[PDB]
Amino acid sequence: YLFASDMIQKFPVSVHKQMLRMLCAKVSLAARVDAGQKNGDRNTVLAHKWKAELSKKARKLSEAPSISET
Amino acid sequence: SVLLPQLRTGWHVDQAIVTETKRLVVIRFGRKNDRQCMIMDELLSSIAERVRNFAVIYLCDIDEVSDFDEMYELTDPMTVMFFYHNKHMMCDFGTGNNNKLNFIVDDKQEMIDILETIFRGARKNKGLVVSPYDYNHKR
Amino acid sequence: PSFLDQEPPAGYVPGIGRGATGFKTLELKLAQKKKKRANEKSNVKRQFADLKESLAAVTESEWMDIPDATDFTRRNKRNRIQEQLNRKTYAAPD
Amino acid sequence: MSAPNPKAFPLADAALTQQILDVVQQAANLRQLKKGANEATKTLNRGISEFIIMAADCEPIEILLHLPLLCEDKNVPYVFVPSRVALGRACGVSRPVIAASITTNDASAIKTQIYAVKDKIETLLI
RNA sequence: AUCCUUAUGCACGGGAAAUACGCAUAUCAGUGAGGAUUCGUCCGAGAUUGUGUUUUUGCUGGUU
Numbered sequence A: 001y002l003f004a005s006d007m008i009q010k011f012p013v014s015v016h017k018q019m020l021r022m023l024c025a026k027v028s029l030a031a032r033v034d035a036g037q038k039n040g041d042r043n044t045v046l047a048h049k050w051k052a053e054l055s056k057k058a059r060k061l062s063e064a065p066s067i068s069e070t
Numbered sequence B: 001s002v003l004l005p006q007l008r009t010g011w012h013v014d015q016a017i018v019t020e021t022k023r024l025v026v027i028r029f030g031r032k033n034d035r036q037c038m039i040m041d042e043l044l045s046s047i048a049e050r051v052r053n054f055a056v057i058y059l060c061d062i063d064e065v066s067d068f069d070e071m072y073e074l075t076d077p078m079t080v081m082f083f084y085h086n087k088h089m090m091c092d093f094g095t096g097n098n099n100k101l102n103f104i105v106d107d108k109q110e111m112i113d114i115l116e117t118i119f120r121g122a123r124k125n126k127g128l129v130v131s132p133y134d135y136n137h138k139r
Numbered sequence C: 001p002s003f004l005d006q007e008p009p010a011g012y013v014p015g016i017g018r019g020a021t022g023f024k025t026l027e028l029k030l031a032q033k034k035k036k037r038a039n040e041k042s043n044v045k046r047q048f049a050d051l052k053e054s055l056a057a058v059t060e061s062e063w064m065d066i067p068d069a070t071d072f073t074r075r076n077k078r079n080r081i082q083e084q085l086n087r088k089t090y091a092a093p094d
Numbered sequence D: 001m002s003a004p005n006p007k008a009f010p011l012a013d014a015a016l017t018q019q020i021l022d023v024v025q026q027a028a029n030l031r032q033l034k035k036g037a038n039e040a041t042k043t044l045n046r047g048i049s050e051f052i053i054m055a056a057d058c059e060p061i062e063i064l065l066h067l068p069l070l071c072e073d074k075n076v077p078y079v080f081v082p083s084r085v086a087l088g089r090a091c092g093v094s095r096p097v098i099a100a101s102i103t104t105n106d107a108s109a110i111k112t113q114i115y116a117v118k119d120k121i122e123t124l125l126i
Numbered sequence E: 001a002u003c004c005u006u007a008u009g010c011a012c013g014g015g016a017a018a019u020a021c022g023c024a025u026a027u028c029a030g031u032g033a034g035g036a037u038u039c040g041u042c043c044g045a046g047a048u049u050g051u052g053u054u055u056u057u058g059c060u061g062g063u064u
């Protein structure tokens, strides 16, 4: 189900196998926080870091090497 | 092409030959518009980096500096002329003129061998060398 | 390339300094004759040129902030591996 | 130090931490150890664990706070040690580690260090 | 006091390999690297990127 998500298929095809793993962990981190969180008050904020990292990290994989002096 | 620098006076030619003690000084004599003087300007530019450690390259135009036309006798679109310690070097490509170079060489690799051969033979004071591949038939 | 920068000669001939070794009526008439013949007797740029005018618009800050050296095939890595694979040889056993 | 995290509990002192981290590493070399959260969470579900060590100053702490509630159901002791960087070293890792679970082998060489430390840890859970 | 276990250090003796061993004012990385799957789940530490040397490194001896 995760494979069909947004944070994966918005990226080139080469970086898919690196982005499941990178996202699947942060899902479980997110899900562990949700259990922890009190029912009356639920606060997001953890997600913001975990998207920021993910989008920024996915860019870097795609970017590719700087060119080399011959 | 913009990789490789150009020499705008005959006085830039002569100092450039002198000041480079340890490396070949390779010069293409010919004029920008030419069909064949553009092609060589490519095959050199690609090679110039690989070779920076034993050879230095420059570009000169017969029209910009015509001072050198009679002494080295320059005819045709372009001539490649190799210098080491002010001594004009010389190689037989099987073509029937041992001075300079005329024809357009085909591969990057076969061009690097010739430079390397000239340098190695040259280092020993030898005035003639032999191009391993002899393109008399070609040109 | 320090000399390349400087720009000034002595009022000096090129051949001599290094130590160099080398390894009007008729004319007028000819010119006239030639003329009597001239009287008698690109695409790529067009394709593009039209784009080049299009460029004019772009700002000088943008001209600067242009990404510089992007490789998309990882050519360098593959080439190195190939050289390493092809380096030496070995002798075949008896 | 910094303000030790109020949710951190039991928090081992200085003298127990030396005794615990030493056991950790002593198990690392027999590969009876398991490092990290998920690796530790796996252990409890299977039922092989001896005790869990956690990092107290794990930032944010909520990411490991599920372990305590799982440990209490499987009846497995646990404690926090004051830094993650120290726990990273003991597991044989360059880099910070927030949790670790020693496991069971009852033929083991170190068996008697472990029962020693669990005995000490279960005291802290009052 | 003997004995036994693991880790690390110096070391005699015995082997195998150098297409192998490193290095970086550099990117991430148990807050999960990279894989396996009988599809239920299972292993858990390096992967990128640039680079140096690599039919050899130092050192002696014979014979001309």
Ligand SMILES: *OP(=O)(O)OP(=O)(O)OC[C@H]1O[C@@H](N2CN(C)c3c2[nH]c(N(C)C)nc3=O)[C@H](O)[C@@H]1O
Pocket: E001
């Ligand atoms: O070898 P040495 O006699 O020098 O030992 P020390 O003089 O350093 O002194 C006291 C320590 O002796 C050891 N011994 C000695 N014996 C006979 C002995 C020891 N230990 C034990 N156990 C503790 C099981 N049993 C013994 O019969 C101890 O290390 C003493 O500290």
